[PDB]
Design a protein around this ligand. Structure first.
Ligand SMILES: *[C@@H]1O[C@H](CO)[C@@H](O)[C@H](O)[C@H]1NC(C)=O
Ligand SMILES: *[C@@H]1O[C@H](CO)[C@@H](O)[C@H](O)[C@H]1NC(C)=O
Ligand SMILES: *[C@@H]1O[C@H](CO)[C@@H](O)[C@H](O)[C@H]1NC(C)=O
Ligand SMILES: *[C@@H]1O[C@H](CO)[C@@H](O)[C@H](O)[C@H]1NC(C)=O
Ligand SMILES: *[C@@H]1O[C@H](CO)[C@@H](O)[C@H](O)[C@H]1NC(C)=O
Ligand SMILES: *[C@@H]1O[C@H](CO)[C@@H](O)[C@H](O)[C@H]1NC(C)=O
Lengths: 321, 158, 321, 158, 158, 321
C-alpha cells in the first residue's frame, strides 16, 4: 500500500521564458500582449474622424477650392492627414507658425465657421478679381475661399482701416495673408502703390508686414508668394487691420466650439466604416490585454504600447512530457 | 527547480489529476486513484492571480507618445523629440520584458515550493509508519485502506 | 521533555505589500516616504527667498513703481512668483526673450543695481515728462523707474549717440525699450520726427529697432505699446546706443554679483517666518526619509520625489494573530 | 512562504520571545521558557539592514525636475518639456514601488529560510534521540534537564 | 544562504575538487578522494550561461546620447536636452546596477539549491543504511568499498 | 566508511555584490564593464576623421584663409572640433542658423566643392578689392575664400541680378552673406548707394536682407560685421540673387555627395594614428564587454554606456576561506 505526492500535467504546449531558461512548457499561461489590429480607420466611441484625404490642415483652414468637402465639418474625434497631401497651398507660399497651429488643433474637436468681413463690404477696392490659375475650381481660376485677394478699384488703392471685435463667447481663429509679388511692375498692376504695408493689431498682437519683392522659381506656374498668418482672438477683443496693398483679407473666421482630446495622425488609409474604442494610425484595437505592440501613437482607451514580439506570463507549472 | 520537487525527485506530472495543481495518488487492495489537495491548490490560485493583477496594475502608468510636428529648420528639436519618445518606449519595453522573465521564474519556483511543502507535511505524519521511497511515494508498513488513506490527506493520521 | 523552534510575534499592526499578497502584517517595518510638509514658504539655510507677491519678474527688473519694495533686494536663496501677478508691465507691451531671462535668473542669487546713464545727463531731450497714467505712483502719472521715456526738447529731437563701457569686473544686465505709438500724430507730438530707429550695439549685439505704428485695443487705457529688450554686457565691453526717437533709455542696470543654485517657483503662498533645508512650492520638508511625495519642484537637500501614496519596507517577519 | 516554516509547519509566532527573531522553547520537569538564538538573529539583522541601505542608496540618483517657462507660441516644446518630466517621474515611481514589492517578498522568505535552517540544524543533532512531532517541536526519549537543554541550543548535543 | 547548504551545514568548499562545481568525497579502507557530479554541474553551467546571455541581451537596447548644439539664446532647450540625456543615463545605470545586484543573489542561491538537492538525493538512497552526520557526510553501517561507493554516485544504491 | 556531499573552492579573490551582502568572494565571476580606452582619436573602420584642429565648422565652410588645410577634404567618418577654435569668423559677425547646419552635418560624410559664380564673372563690380586685415593670409589682407566681397567699380554699384540653377543630381549647400558697416560714410565708400538690399530666392526661400548700420565695439580691430546665411538648393531648382550693395556673393558651393552616420565631437585631442571600431571624445574602445563607462557620446559598434565604476556578475559560488 502506497501514497504519493504529485502534481498536474496536461497536453498544453504553451511556452514561457525565464532568465535561466527559455521555451519552458507550462500547463497554463497568460498572454498579455495584443498583436492584432483590424487595419482600418474607425469611429472613436461612435464619433467619426475628420479624414482629409488629399487635403492638408493648411488647405482645409484657408479654404483651398479643392477642399470643398470640408467647407462645413461636424465634431470630430481625431484628425487624419496623409504624409504628403497634394492639396495644400495651391498658390505657393508659407503658413506662419504652422506647427504651433496644428498643435492647437490637437486640443480642439469642433470648429464653426463664421463670416467676419463680408465680400460685399469692400467699397473702395475690387474683391472679385483676386483669383489665380494656381488655384483652379471647375476649370476656372479661383482662390482660397476663406480669405479675399483685394485689388485696386479703377486704378486706386485707398488705405484700408478695418476693425472686428468678437462679440462671440468663444475664441476665434482669424486667418489672413500677404502677397509677395516678383517685380515692381506687378506691384503697380495689382495694387498701384509701390511701397506698402499691412498692420495687424489685437490686445496682444502688434504686427506690421512688408512685402518682399524678388524674382523666384515658378512653383505651380507661379513666382508670386502668399504668406499666411493667424491669431487667436479672445472674446471682447478687437482685431484692427490697416493696409494700402498686398492684403489678403479675412472673409471667414473659425469659432472654436469644443475643446477635447484629439490628435492629427499620419495615415495613408481611408475610412473603414467601423467603430472602435482604441485607434492607431495602422488600424483599430479591440482587446482587454494590458499591452499591445501595434503603434506608439494611439487615441482612446488603449493598452500600453511596448516594442515586444511576445509577453507571456506563466500561471501554471512546468509541464512534463 | 530551486525546491527540488517538480522534475526533481518527483520525475513528472500526472495527466490523471485534472482536479487541482497538487495532490495525492493512493494504491491499495481496494484500488487506486487521484485526489487534489484543495487547500494548497487554492492558495496557489490566489497567489498567482494576485501576482498577475499586480503586474498589470504596476504597468498601467507607462509613457504615452504624442504627435508633434516641426518645420525644416527645427531639426534639432524634432530629433530631441524623437530620441525622448523612443527613449521612454525602450525603458518601458525593458521594464515589461524583464518583469515577465523574473516573475515567470518565481512562479515556477512557487509551484515547486508548494509541492515540496505538501510532500514534507505528509512525511512528518507518516514518520516510521512508512518507507520513504525516494520518488514522491511512501510505502506503508501495515495495510492501509481507503479511510486510512483519507486520513493522510486530511491531516489526521497516526 | 520537549524543545521547539519558533519565531517572534508581537502586537504590531504595520502592513507591507508583496507581489503575491497585499496587506501582510509584519512584526517590524520601515516607512521610507515623507508625506508631510508644513505648508509654508521658509528661508533656505537661513537665507530668505525673494518673494514678489503681486509683482512679476518683468515688473521687478524694469522697475514698475508699484514694485518699490524691490528697489534694493538682498541676496536671495530662491524666488517666488504668483501664477498671474497683477503688477507686471503697467504700460502694456512685450518683454523680448523673457523666458530666456527668467532662465538666467535661476543661476543668479544676487543683483546690485547701478546707474549707467543718469537722468541729469540728457541735454538735448526732455527726461522728466516721459510718464503715463497706466503706471501711477501715489496718485500721479509715473513710469518704470529703471528706464527713461525720452521726449523732444522745445520741439526738437536730435539724434542720440550714447556709449557705455562696463568697467565693472562683473557681468551687467542692461535693459532698454522702444515705444510703439498708435498713429502718425502721436509720433509727431512725442518725438517730432516721423520715421525713426533705435540701434543698439555691443561686441556681439547688432540691433536696429523700428517702431510699429498701428491702432490697437486699449490695454489698461492705453493703445501705445512698449517693447523691452535686454542684453548681458561682458566686462571691458561697451554698449552703443543711437536713436532719433521712440527710445526708452537705460537709467539703471543690474550687476550680477553672485551665481548660485536658485529657482523661480510658482506659489500663491506668502512668507511663513520659518527656516528649512528643503523647500517646495507647497511647503517645506523636514525629514530623513529617502523619498517624499510632496511636489516635483524642490530646492535644497531633498528626498527624491515619487508619485506614491505609500512606500513601506518589511524588516521583520510575518506577524501571527 | 517558500520555505514552509513560518505560518507553515510552525503555525504561529511567539508573543513570549522578545529576545530575538528566532529561537527555542523548552519544557521539562524544572520548567519552561524562551531563548533567542543570537547567531541567526544577528545574521538576519545584518542582512535586512544592508538591504535597506542598498535600497536607499540605489535610489538616490533619481530625476530632478526643473522649472522652465515658455511663451504662448512655444506650446510644442512646453509640452515636450512636460511629457519628459512626467515621463521620468513615472519611471522612477515604477522603479521604487516595484523594488519595494519584490524585496518585501524576499525579506519574508529570508526569515522563513532562517527559521527552517535553524530547525534543520536542531533536527540533525537530535537524530533518533527525539520524536519529530511535526509542529516545530521535538519530544525527547530520555529525560532532558536544563543543561541537556542548553546543549541543543549550543550545538553540543549527543 | 537560503537553502542552508553552502557555508551552512556544509561548512566550507573543497580545494581538492577541481573536477566540477558539486560532487562527492568518499573514504574507506581502499582510500579516499573526490568525484564531481557531472549532471548537476552541467545543469548549473547551462543555467548560469543562459542567465548571463539573457542579461547582456536585455541590456543592448539602451539610450544612445547624441551631440546637439544650441546658441546663447536657446538656454532653456539646451538645458532640456541635457536633463533628458542625463535622465536616461541615470535610469539605465540604475537598471544595470540593480539587475546585477539581484541576479548575483539569485546565482549564489541557485548553487546553494543545487548542493542541497544533491545532498537530499543521496540522503533518500542511503536511508537507514547510514548515519547522517550533520555536516554533509553519511557514515555507513556496513563496509562500503569502491563499487559500493560508485553505486551511491550513480543512483543505484540499495 | 564515509561519503560526503560538497562543493568547489579555489584561490579566487574576485568579489561580487548582492542586495544583502557586499564584497562576497566567489569562485568565478564575469566583469561586464569596459573601463579602459587608449586616449587617442583614431580612424573608424579604416576611415579617417575630419580633425579641424584650430578651425571651426564656420571657419571651414566659409573658407577662412587660415583653414587652407581644409580646402579639399576626403570622405570622413566623423568630425572633431575643439571647445573654442581660434580660427572662426576672422572678420567678426554671425552665422545664421548655425546649429541647424552643424546638425545637418552629422548626417553627411562627404562634401565636394564646386564653383557656382566665378570671380571672373563680375563685370560691373570690383571683385579683387574685397579683403580685410582681420582675415590675413601670408601677411597680406585676404578674405573668406568661398564668398566674394563685392565693391563698386569706378564709383558705381549697378543692381546685381544673378541666377544659378543646380544641374547637379546631388543637393547643394549654398553660402552667402551681408556686410553691416558702422557708419553712413563707409557705406558710400564701399558701395556708393545709401539704402541697400540683398534679395535671395529659391523655390522655398523668400529672403530680403537689409544692412544694419551702427557703431559698435572693435572685435578683431573691426567694427563692421558680416552675417552669413545658407540654404540647401534642391536639384532642378534655381537660386536668384538681387542686390545693389553689401552683398557677399557665393563663389564656391558644396555638393553633398554622401549621407551617412556621423557626429561632430568636442575634443582637445589630436590625431592618434590608430584604427578602431568604437570612438569616444576621450579615446577609442576595443572590447567585447556589453557595457563601458568611458563617455556617453560614441560612434561605431560600441558597448552601452553606464555611469558605473563596477559591474561584476557572479557565475560560480561562495568561495570558502
Ligand atoms: C524557442 O522557441 C521559439 C518558437 O517556438 C523559437 O523561435 C526559438 O528559436 C526558441 N528559442 C531557443 C533559445 O531555443
Ligand atoms: C532649372 O534648370 C533645369 C535645367 O535647365 C530646368 O530643367 C528646370 O526647369 C529649371 N527650373 C527652374 C525653376 O528654373
Ligand atoms: C489593504 O488595506 C488598505 C488600508 O488598510 C485598504 O485601503 C485596502 O483596500 C486593502 N487592500 C486590499 C487588497 O485588501
Ligand atoms: C469690444 O467690443 C465689446 C462689445 O461692443 C465692447 O464691450 C468692448 O469694450 C470692446 N473692446 C474693445 C477693445 O474695443
Ligand atoms: C568592499 O571592497 C572594496 C574594494 O575591495 C572597498 O573599497 C569597499 O570599501 C568594501 N565595501 C565594504 C562595504 O566593505
Ligand atoms: C572698454 O573700456 C575699457 C576701459 O576703458 C577699455 O580698456 C577697453 O579697451 C574698452 N573697449 C572698447 C570696445 O571700447
Amino acid at each position: 500500500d502506497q501514497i504519493c505526492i504529485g502534481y498536474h500535467a496536461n497536453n498544453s504546449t504553451e511556452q514561457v521564458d525565464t532568465i535561466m531558461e527559455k521555451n519552458v512548457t507550462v500547463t497554463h499561461a497568460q498572454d498579455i500582449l495584443e498583436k492584432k489590429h483590424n487595419g482600418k480607420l474607425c469611429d472613436l466611441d461612435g464619433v467619426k474622424p475628420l479624414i482629409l484625404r488629399d487635403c492638408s490642415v493648411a488647405g482645409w483652414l484657408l479654404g483651398n477650392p479643392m477642399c470643398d468637402e470640408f467647407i462645413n465639418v461636424p465634431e470630430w474625434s481625431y484628425i487624419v492627414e496623409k504624409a504628403n497631401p497634394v492639396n495644400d497651398l495651391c498658390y505657393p507660399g508659407d503658413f506662419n507658425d504652422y506647427e504651433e497651429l496644428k498643435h492647437l488643433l490637437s486640443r480642439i474637436n469642433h470648429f464653426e465657421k463664421i463670416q467676419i468681413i463680408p465680400k460685399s463690404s469692400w467699397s473702395s477696392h475690387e474683391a472679385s478679381l483676386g483669383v489665380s490659375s494656381a488655384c483652379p475650381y471647375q476649370g476656372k481660376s479661383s482662390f482660397f475661399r476663406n480669405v479675399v485677394w483685394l485689388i485696386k478699384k479703377n486704378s486706386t488703392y485707398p488705405t484700408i482701416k478695418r476693425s472686428y471685435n468678437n462679440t462671440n463667447q468663444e475664441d476665434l481663429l482669424v486667418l489672413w495673408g500677404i502677397h509677395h509679388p516678383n517685380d515692381a511692375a506687378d506691384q503697380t498692376k495689382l495694387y498701384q502703390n509701390p511701397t506698402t504695408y499691412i498692420s495687424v493689431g489685437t490686445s496682444t498682437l502688434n504686427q506690421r508686414l512688408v512685402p518682399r519683392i524678388a524674382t523666384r522659381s515658378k512653383v505651380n506656374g507661379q513666382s508670386g508668394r502668399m504668406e499666411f498668418f493667424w491669431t487667436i482672438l479672445k472674446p471682447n477683443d478687437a482685431i484692427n487691420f490697416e493696409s494700402n496693398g498686398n492684403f489678403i483679407a479675412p472673409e471667414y473666421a473659425y469659432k472654436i466650439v469644443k475643446k477635447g482630446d484629439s490628435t492629427i495622425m499620419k495615415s495613408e488609409l481611408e475610412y473603414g466604416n467601423c467603430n472602435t474604442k482604441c485607434q492607431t494610425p495602422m488600424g483599430a484595437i479591440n482587446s482587454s490585454m494590458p499591452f499591445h505592440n501595434i503603434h506608439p501613437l494611439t487615441i482612446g482607451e488603449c493598452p500600453k504600447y511596448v516594442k515586444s514580439n511576445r509577453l507571456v506570463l506563466a500561471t501554471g507549472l512546468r509541464n512534463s512530457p | 527547480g530551486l525546491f527540488g520537487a517538480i522534475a526533481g525527485f518527483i520525475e513528472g506530472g500526472w495527466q490523471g489529476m485534472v482536479d487541482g495543481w497538487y495532490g495525492y495518488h493512493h494504491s491499495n487492495e481496494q484500488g487506486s486513484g487521484y485526489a487534489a489537495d484543495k487547500e494548497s491548490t487554492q492558495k496557489a490560485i490566489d497567489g498567482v492571480t494576485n501576482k498577475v493583477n499586480s503586474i498589470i496594475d504596476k504597468m498601467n502608468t507607462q509613457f504615452e507618445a504624442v504627435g508633434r510636428e516641426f518645420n525644416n529648420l527645427e531639426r534639432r528639436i524634432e530629433n530631441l523629440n524623437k530620441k525622448m519618445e523612443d527613449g521612454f518606449l525602450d525603458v518601458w519595453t525593458y521594464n515589461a520584458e524583464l518583469l515577465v522573465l523574473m516573475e515567470n521564474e518565481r512562479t515556477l519556483d512557487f509551484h515547486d515550493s508548494n509541492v515540496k511543502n505538501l510532500y514534507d507535511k505528509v512525511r512528518l505524519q507518516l514518520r516510521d509508519n512508512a518507507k520513504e521511497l525516494g520518488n514522491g511515494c511512501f510505502e506503508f508498513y501495515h495495510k492501509c485502506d481507503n479511510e486510512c488513506m483519507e486520513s493522510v490527506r486530511n491531516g489526521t493520521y497516526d
